[PDB]
Design an enzyme around this catalytic site. Structure first.
Site, PDB file in Angstrom:
ATOM      1  N   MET A   1       0.844  -1.181   0.000  1.00 46.35           N
ATOM      2  CA  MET A   1       0.000   0.000   0.000  1.00 46.35           C
ATOM      3  C   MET A   1       0.890   1.246   0.000  1.00 46.35           C
ATOM      4  SD  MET A   1      -3.421  -0.993   1.955  1.00 46.35           S
ATOM      5  CE  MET A   1      -2.887  -0.616   3.557  1.00 46.35           C
ATOM      6  N   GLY A   2       2.114   1.083  -0.495  1.00 42.70           N
ATOM      7  CA  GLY A   2       3.057   2.201  -0.556  1.00 42.70           C
ATOM      8  C   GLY A   2       3.758   2.502   0.761  1.00 42.70           C
ATOM      9  N   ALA A   3       4.462   3.636   0.842  1.00 41.91           N
ATOM     10  CA  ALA A   3       5.218   4.006   2.053  1.00 41.91           C
ATOM     11  C   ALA A   3       6.164   2.860   2.396  1.00 41.91           C
ATOM     12  CB  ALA A   3       4.270   4.275   3.217  1.00 41.91           C
ATOM     13  N   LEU A   4       7.006   2.491   1.436  1.00 43.13           N
ATOM     14  CA  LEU A   4       7.914   1.355   1.579  1.00 43.13           C
ATOM     15  C   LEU A   4       9.075   1.495   2.554  1.00 43.13           C
ATOM     16  CD1 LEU A   4       8.156   0.436  -2.251  1.00 43.13           C
ATOM     17  CD2 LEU A   4       6.353  -0.157  -0.612  1.00 43.13           C
ATOM     18  N   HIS A   5       9.308   0.448   3.343  1.00 46.43           N
ATOM     19  CA  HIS A   5      10.444   0.441   4.267  1.00 46.43           C
ATOM     20  C   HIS A   5      11.178  -0.894   4.132  1.00 46.43           C
ATOM     21  CE1 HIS A   5       8.035  -2.105   6.853  1.00 46.43           C
ATOM     22  NE2 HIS A   5       7.130  -1.157   7.002  1.00 46.43           N
ATOM     23  N   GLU A   6      12.192  -1.121   4.972  1.00 46.79           N
ATOM     24  CA  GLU A   6      13.001  -2.331   4.897  1.00 46.79           C
ATOM     25  C   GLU A   6      12.169  -3.600   4.950  1.00 46.79           C
ATOM     26  OE1 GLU A   6      16.251  -2.648   4.055  1.00 46.79           O
ATOM     27  OE2 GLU A   6      16.204  -0.461   3.865  1.00 46.79           O
ATOM     28  N   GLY A   7      11.032  -3.527   5.634  1.00 48.86           N
ATOM     29  CA  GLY A   7      10.155  -4.693   5.714  1.00 48.86           C
ATOM     30  C   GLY A   7       9.688  -5.048   4.306  1.00 48.86           C
ATOM     31  N   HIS A   8       9.214  -4.052   3.562  1.00 49.16           N
ATOM     32  CA  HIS A   8       8.764  -4.322   2.193  1.00 49.16           C
ATOM     33  C   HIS A   8       9.924  -4.775   1.347  1.00 49.16           C
ATOM     34  CE1 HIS A   8       6.095  -1.180   3.769  1.00 49.16           C
ATOM     35  NE2 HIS A   8       5.139  -1.733   3.043  1.00 49.16           N
TER      36      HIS A   8
ATOM     37  N   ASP B   1       9.020   8.550  -4.016  1.00 47.72           N
ATOM     38  CA  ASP B   1      10.006   7.867  -3.198  1.00 47.72           C
ATOM     39  C   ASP B   1       9.847   6.348  -3.243  1.00 47.72           C
ATOM     40  OD1 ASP B   1      10.396   6.690  -0.069  1.00 47.72           O
ATOM     41  OD2 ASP B   1      12.114   7.712  -0.983  1.00 47.72           O
ATOM     42  N   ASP B   2       8.607   5.871  -3.285  1.00 47.97           N
ATOM     43  CA  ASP B   2       8.409   4.427  -3.346  1.00 47.97           C
ATOM     44  C   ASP B   2       8.997   3.899  -4.649  1.00 47.97           C
ATOM     45  OD1 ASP B   2       7.135   4.384  -0.881  1.00 47.97           O
ATOM     46  OD2 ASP B   2       5.111   4.427  -1.738  1.00 47.97           O
TER      47      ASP B   2
ATOM     48  N   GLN C   1      12.777   3.584  -4.545  1.00 49.00           N
ATOM     49  CA  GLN C   1      13.269   2.422  -3.809  1.00 49.00           C
ATOM     50  C   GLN C   1      13.158   1.176  -4.668  1.00 49.00           C
ATOM     51  OE1 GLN C   1      12.997   2.083   0.496  1.00 49.00           O
ATOM     52  NE2 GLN C   1      11.247   3.496   0.364  1.00 49.00           N
TER      53      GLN C   1
ATOM     54  N   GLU D   1       5.428 -12.199   7.569  1.00 52.18           N
ATOM     55  CA  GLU D   1       4.901 -12.984   8.702  1.00 52.18           C
ATOM     56  C   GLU D   1       4.409 -12.092   9.824  1.00 52.18           C
ATOM     57  OE1 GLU D   1       7.748 -15.858  10.037  1.00 52.18           O
ATOM     58  OE2 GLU D   1       7.479 -17.106   8.280  1.00 52.18           O
ATOM     59  N   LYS D   2       4.837 -10.831   9.841  1.00 47.94           N
ATOM     60  CA  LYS D   2       4.387  -9.924  10.901  1.00 47.94           C
ATOM     61  C   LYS D   2       2.861  -9.947  11.014  1.00 47.94           C
ATOM     62  CE  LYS D   2       3.705  -5.573  10.419  1.00 47.94           C
ATOM     63  NZ  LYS D   2       3.975  -4.127  10.123  1.00 47.94           N
ATOM     64  N   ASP D   3       2.163  -9.937   9.874  1.00 47.11           N
ATOM     65  CA  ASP D   3       0.700  -9.992   9.884  1.00 47.11           C
ATOM     66  C   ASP D   3       0.350 -11.462   9.648  1.00 47.11           C
ATOM     67  OD1 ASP D   3      -0.008  -7.012   9.827  1.00 47.11           O
ATOM     68  OD2 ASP D   3       1.509  -7.224   8.214  1.00 47.11           O
TER      69      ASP D   3
ATOM     70  N   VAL E   1      10.945  -8.340   9.514  1.00 47.39           N
ATOM     71  CA  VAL E   1      12.131  -7.524   9.599  1.00 47.39           C
ATOM     72  C   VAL E   1      11.958  -6.693  10.876  1.00 47.39           C
ATOM     73  CG1 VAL E   1      13.432  -5.664   8.530  1.00 47.39           C
ATOM     74  CG2 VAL E   1      12.409  -7.469   7.112  1.00 47.39           C
TER      75      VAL E   1
ATOM     76  N   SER F   1       7.334  -1.232  11.167  1.00 48.39           N
ATOM     77  CA  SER F   1       5.977  -0.923  10.759  1.00 48.39           C
ATOM     78  C   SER F   1       5.941   0.581  10.538  1.00 48.39           C
ATOM     79  CB  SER F   1       4.997  -1.312  11.884  1.00 48.39           C
ATOM     80  OG  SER F   1       3.721  -1.691  11.385  1.00 48.39           O
ATOM     81  N   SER F   2       5.237   1.012   9.498  1.00 45.38           N
ATOM     82  CA  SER F   2       5.132   2.443   9.226  1.00 45.38           C
ATOM     83  C   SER F   2       4.522   3.147  10.438  1.00 45.38           C
ATOM     84  CB  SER F   2       4.265   2.677   7.971  1.00 45.38           C
ATOM     85  OG  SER F   2       4.908   2.084   6.832  1.00 45.38           O
ATOM     86  N   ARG F   3       3.586   2.475  11.100  1.00 44.60           N
ATOM     87  CA  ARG F   3       2.925   3.098  12.261  1.00 44.60           C
ATOM     88  C   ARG F   3       3.855   3.361  13.466  1.00 44.60           C
ATOM     89  NH1 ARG F   3      -1.565  -1.169  13.456  1.00 44.60           N
ATOM     90  NH2 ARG F   3      -1.339  -1.403  11.178  1.00 44.60           N
TER      91      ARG F   3
HETATM   92  N1  LIG Z   1       8.505  -5.684   9.493  1.00 46.23           N
HETATM   93  C1  LIG Z   1       8.030  -6.324   8.401  1.00 46.23           C
HETATM   94  N2  LIG Z   1       8.692  -7.426   7.911  1.00 46.23           N
HETATM   95  C2  LIG Z   1       8.232  -8.092   6.825  1.00 46.23           C
HETATM   96  N3  LIG Z   1       7.136  -7.795   6.122  1.00 46.23           N
HETATM   97  C3  LIG Z   1       6.486  -6.685   6.629  1.00 46.23           C
HETATM   98  C4  LIG Z   1       6.868  -5.917   7.740  1.00 46.23           C
HETATM   99  N4  LIG Z   1       6.000  -4.904   7.956  1.00 46.23           N
HETATM  100  C5  LIG Z   1       5.133  -5.073   7.001  1.00 46.23           C
HETATM  101  N5  LIG Z   1       5.339  -6.122   6.156  1.00 46.23           N
HETATM  102  C6  LIG Z   1       4.558  -6.573   5.023  1.00 46.23           C
HETATM  103  O1  LIG Z   1       4.367  -5.501   4.062  1.00 46.23           O
HETATM  104  C7  LIG Z   1       3.102  -5.733   3.376  1.00 46.23           C
HETATM  105  C8  LIG Z   1       2.290  -4.413   3.361  1.00 46.23           C
HETATM  106  O2  LIG Z   1       1.663  -4.096   4.640  1.00 46.23           O
HETATM  107  P1  LIG Z   1       1.453  -2.515   5.138  1.00 46.23           P
HETATM  108  O3  LIG Z   1       0.380  -2.543   6.120  1.00 46.23           O
HETATM  109  O4  LIG Z   1       1.067  -1.771   3.941  1.00 46.23           O
HETATM  110  C9  LIG Z   1       2.872  -1.984   5.757  1.00 46.23           C
HETATM  111  P2  LIG Z   1       3.058  -1.795   7.361  1.00 46.23           P
HETATM  112  O5  LIG Z   1       4.452  -1.518   7.777  1.00 46.23           O
HETATM  113  O6  LIG Z   1       2.520  -3.054   8.071  1.00 46.23           O
HETATM  114  O7  LIG Z   1       2.218  -0.506   7.724  1.00 46.23           O
HETATM  115  P3  LIG Z   1       1.254  -0.156   8.951  1.00 46.23           P
HETATM  116  O8  LIG Z   1       2.153   0.153  10.239  1.00 46.23           O
HETATM  117  O9  LIG Z   1       0.480   1.111   8.527  1.00 46.23           O
HETATM  118  O10 LIG Z   1       0.308  -1.342   9.189  1.00 46.23           O
HETATM  119  C10 LIG Z   1       2.435  -6.942   4.180  1.00 46.23           C
HETATM  120  O11 LIG Z   1       2.702  -8.219   3.472  1.00 46.23           O
HETATM  121  C11 LIG Z   1       3.149  -6.901   5.484  1.00 46.23           C
HETATM  122  O12 LIG Z   1       2.996  -8.115   6.230  1.00 46.23           O
HETATM  123 MG   LIG Z   2       0.490  -3.247   8.137  1.00 47.58          MG
END
Ligand SMILES: Nc1ncnc2c1ncn2[C@@H]1O[C@H](COP(=O)(O)CP(=O)(O)OP(=O)(O)O)[C@@H](O)[C@H]1O
Ligand SMILES: [Mg+2]
Ligand SMILES: Nc1ncnc2c1ncn2[C@@H]1O[C@H](COP(=O)(O)CP(=O)(O)OP(=O)(O)O)[C@@H](O)[C@H]1O
Ligand SMILES: CC(C)(CO)[C@@H](O)C(=O)[O-]
Ligand SMILES: [Mg+2]
Lengths: 286, 281
Positions: free
Chosen positions: B39-46, B81-82, B85, B152-154, B180, B189-191
């Site tokens: 959903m954009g706003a990409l970080h190391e997790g993505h 920016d997305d 990356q 796996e976080k979600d 990650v 997490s972006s949050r």
């Molecule tokens: N720390 C992390 N490590 C690995 N994958 C991650 C991650 N954080 C998010 N993802 C994955 O990135 C994908 C997009 O999820 P998003 O909700 O858009 C990002 P987010 O960082 O979880 O934002 P959020 O804090 O607003 O919920 C999902 O498959 C999610 O599980």
């Molecule tokens: Mg999320």
């Protein structure tokens, strides 16, 4: 790839078998056509099969599966007609190369878990008194489409609301398949062919001609407007002995949240004894 | 005619039909299409998801960027920016559709998840996972990838997508990518950007509780649960919504064997979640 004998009817029950064969055929250039049925095949189903067979380079897959999920009660499910031997005999006579006959366990190993929730149209007409019926139909059709992955899928216009809902399913889930509606096949007097017609005794069979007669009368009366069309249909139904109308409605062709404007569909549902019959026809107003 | 595709470059498509045609054409040319929904706003997790997809030999990576209204209760946007990356990562396809293109007829036919969707995260947001499965099903049909990647976080989202794939007979491999984490263990997490200093320090309790439980697990399920509870109890301002040990498919945890421990908590106005593999005994 399970054994596949070209030119002969190949019957597969395992979803994996038909999936592998279909993929293999598709990879060699053949176009896979799917005709979903619940068995108890009659000339109406054969028209779907023929429509499929005429597509150049086609390989036809007819699925036969009495889907439990679209029946509201086990009583209706047990009552559904089953004539497996005649069905396969008809498919072999038609030159069909693949019949897919899955078991309930293979299709619902986890019971009802993830399912398809249809749009608002599913709660009207046929869905009014049977609120979970179309979720059952769309869920199984979605699965059949994923297993077989046909280029085109064929449905009869007789169950018009079902056809419309399947077009919604395909559009709404971005499915890469063409939905082909096939005109309703009728007996010599106009009666829409249906597996339920076998439950009409001689008198009911005689009276049932009123549905098609009412619809075609309405289609010609329509030059005079919607009211004239509906009243012509009502008069025919009212003159029929032992025909209890459930509904008679004139709707836009997409049956959706749009008023009738020029091209419509007239749909009827009526009970003759315990047998509920359906029919519908294209209508042009004015 | 198929839309243009320039190998080695970041090709951006907004039309579903366009990415659908390119993906199909590429699959035919000897590539394995990998889909990474975001959903954009990409970080190391993505980026970990992206790298996982890139590793597959012959891969062409499709990263979707779509803020799905259906999964929000009835959001940060950095397009340029997305895309930078993704380009830096060597991604060749970015799919950026508009809400109107994804939902041309509004919400009509949708996916109804099984009962797991009403539990855990589904408690506060009962329509959330229907939104997620509906958009993921659509993305799978548009892109037709060989594999789809989720973090796996979600975990509950991951399990429900595995249910979707199995239940609808979808021909795609679902790949869960390990979470990650920041250096102290906090799941990225972006949050996390909303946490003030005190909350950010207290937030380490979620991951510390899970890891403590994973190691306490040699002593049994109760010991694992009590250890995680003790860690969370040592943090101020951490309102635990749930702390549950379940089997790997999120059903009831078996006598012994593999499982998953999940936690969610509110720190001020920010809800955080995390989970970990647990081996009982
Ligand atoms: N720390 C992390 N490590 C690995 N994958 C991650 C991650 N954080 C998010 N993802 C994955 O990135 C994908 C997009 O999820 P998003 O909700 O858009 C990002 P987010 O960082 O979880 O934002 P959020 O804090 O607003 O919920 C999902 O498959 C999610 O599980
Ligand atoms: Mg999320
Ligand atoms: N008279 C007819 N002409 C063309 N297609 C028909 C038809 N009757 C049924 N079909 C189509 O055949 C497919 C399978 O429907 P079935 O329910 O298996 C048979 P049925 O004749 O509709 O029995 P039923 O009355 O117990 O529902 C559907 O796509 C249906 O619309
Ligand atoms: C479409 C269908 C084969 C789904 O079971 C069934 O509803 C039918 O017979 O029309
Ligand atoms: Mg029928």
């Amino acid at each position: 790839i399970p054994a596949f004998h070209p030119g002969e009817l190949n019957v597969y029950s395992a979803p994996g078998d038909v999936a592998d064969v279909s993929r293999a055929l598709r990879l060699t250039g053949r176009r896979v056509m799917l005709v979903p049925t619940m068995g108890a095949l009659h000339e109406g189903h054969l028209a779907l099969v023929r429509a499929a067979k005429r597509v150049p380079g086609s390989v036809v897959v007819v699925s036969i599966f009495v889907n439990p999920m679209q029946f509201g009660a086990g009583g209706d499910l047990d009552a559904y007609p089953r004539t497996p031997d005649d069905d396969l005999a008809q498919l072999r006579a038609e030159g069909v190369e693949i019949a897919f006959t899955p078991t309930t366990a293979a299709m619902y190993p986890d019971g009802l878990r993830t399912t398809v929730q249809p749009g608002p149209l599913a709660a009207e007409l046929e869905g009014g008194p049977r609120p979970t019926h179309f979720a059952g139909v769309l869920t199984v059709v979605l699965k059949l489409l994923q297993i077989v992955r046909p280029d085109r899928v064929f449905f009869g216009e007789k169950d018009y609301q079902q056809l419309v809902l399947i077009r919604q399913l395909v559009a709404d889930f971005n499915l890469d398949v063409a939905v082909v509606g096939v005109p309703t096949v009728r007996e010599a007097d106009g009666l829409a062919m249906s597996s339920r017609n076998r439950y009409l005794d001689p008198a009911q069979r005689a009276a049932a001609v009123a549905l098609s007669a009412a619809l075609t009368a309405a289609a010609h009366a329509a030059t005079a407007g919607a009211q004239a069309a509906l009243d012509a249909a009502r008069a025919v139904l009212d003159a029929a002995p032992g025909v209890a109308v459930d509904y008679l409605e004139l709707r836009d062709i997409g049956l959706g949240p749009m008023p009738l404007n020029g091209s419509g569909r007239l749909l009827v549902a009526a009970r003759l004894g315990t047998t509920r019959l359906l029919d519908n026809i294209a209508i042009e107003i004015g």
